[model samples]
Target: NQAKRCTVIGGSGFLGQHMVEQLLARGYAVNVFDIQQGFDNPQVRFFLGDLCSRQDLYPALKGVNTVFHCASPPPSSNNKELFYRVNYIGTKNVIETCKEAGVQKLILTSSASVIFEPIDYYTETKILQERAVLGANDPEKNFLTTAIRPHGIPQLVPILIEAARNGKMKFVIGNGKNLVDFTFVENVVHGHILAAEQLSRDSTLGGKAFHILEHH
Candidate 1:
């Protein structure tokens, strides 16, 4: 049985699109809040809007009981301010909007790099983003937020395979010595659904954080 509906911010992007697909396959109607179009699924709907606007989120939250917020800006973006605005402030707006919309659950796609010791601008904001989201959660209002921090999905597997077939050897980070956890894309989606379902069934996961990954 379908327990509820969902709205995924940035549902047209890499990770968001996959999560939307998973939700739709599980018999959930999904509303995508993104700027892009061209999806062929009937179960998924689109709302082209920016995360900076709290008002624009209301329509997307009309009947959305669950929210999968995956609309973060690229860490490599040239504009540093845009990164913080979209990654941190934009997420803040979404959380505040969800709170106002009375959404029952929120699953955020955060990065595992939040804890990694780094001097880059990207890691700096991830720390802030994670903190803000955790600090903003409220349980008394029936709002819960859970985060998944897979080191990253090996979505580049196909590209690597294709490149390797053409005689180009695969290259990795730090001479492949840094053993970062790699998660299958489908496993990440499964983890999100399982975590959300468990949250609903147990109700003890609100205002807390958990890590979902394919590796220890």
Candidate 2:
């Protein structure tokens, strides 16, 4: 039997929702944990709570075999406090809660910005968050943890397309000599599911962070 269960911590958001759908499609029972409910699927169960609070996450962690911690504040938000609270503190809570609930695998949805030079609050916090997740991996404790670094997610592509249509995509963020990698939402979700499945089969990936980008 190749049966495994999963929970998407920020299942209501864009990347998270794609992960949830892909997991379900792969025969894994999914639990959607989020402050808001943005999806309606009969096969998926919803758990409403704050990701920062252990008490709120306990219910969602119950009976979960794999945890996908995709919850984080948007990078566009100027609130530094909110970023630290959710990306750093909240992620720590997720790790602790998963241990208490006996989750076997935890795959964090981290950003590719973590690899870049820290130029913004969001990127700085993401680097810290990735370290926390990778450092939390404990084989003796029967828990495996890994992080996925996805760049230029599909969610932002639509916005860029619209901007181009309006001729507003003129401004280049940097010196216009930058080469960036991008991944489709579905491809990112595929990478996540593959990582979770490989967690039990491979121990080398434990405590490691992988980059998920679609090859052009």
Candidate 3:
């Protein structure tokens, strides 16, 4: 248990929801700032707001020691403008307010694809946002930051299951099958919690990015 306080931006999304639950269990009095309240949890304080507005976000970050920026457009969307607007522009507003709020740590949930060539706007904005997040690190000012690059936490598809033997047929690699790296949603949550706990003014976790995976 710790006395730290945190505000999880975009805490209503799938990954964000997991982020909030774990933060509560770890004893961080959690504040969730998002566009909507996706669930009812007595342990969290949900502040509904647009990520592009600092005024709306300040109310949630005040007196908070850490800020977790995990909000983004839905993965299946095709709108390029919305992608940049929320992921890149919206993230800038987050950093500005986090500093104004005097928050000590900023842990960003960036995509693993940001480090490589991305084929979509959703992926491109993540890279732009991450550059700003990591560049904002100023341990001298007690503004420590780190970005986590987590692989896709997949959603189930029944049709694929029917054809690929429940998506497990690849286990018998006697033949070729499409391969991709991925992480369980739980593992992604664990990675963020650890990143937040380990980040500090002088800690090496600041101003860098790390990949989260199930195993070596």
**Best candidate, TM-score-wise?**
2
Candidate 1 lDDT over 90-209, as tens digits, reads 888888888888888888877765555425566577667777776766777778787766555212111111233653331211212222442467667767777777767665665555
How well is each residue in 1-216 modelled by candidate 3, as lDDT tens digits? 233888889899899988888777767888999988998698888998789998998999999888988898886887889989998989999999999888889999987766654167777788899999999998788899989887672332212112344733211111112112323675677777777767752466687877643342
Instruction: Give lDDT: candidate 3, residue 143.
Output: 92
RMSD after CA superposition, every candidate: 10.6, 10.3, 9.6
Q: Rank the candidates by lDDT, best first.
A: 2, 3, 1
Off by over 4 Å in 3: 1-3, 153-183
Pick by lDDT: 1 or 2, better one = 2
TM-score of each: 0.79, 0.83, 0.82
Model 3 has a clash total of: 0
The local lDDT score (0 to 100) that residue 73 gets in candidate 1 is 72
> lDDT at 131 for candidate 1?
75
Cα shift from native, residue 140, model 2 (Å): 1.5
Better of 1 and 2 by TM-score: 2
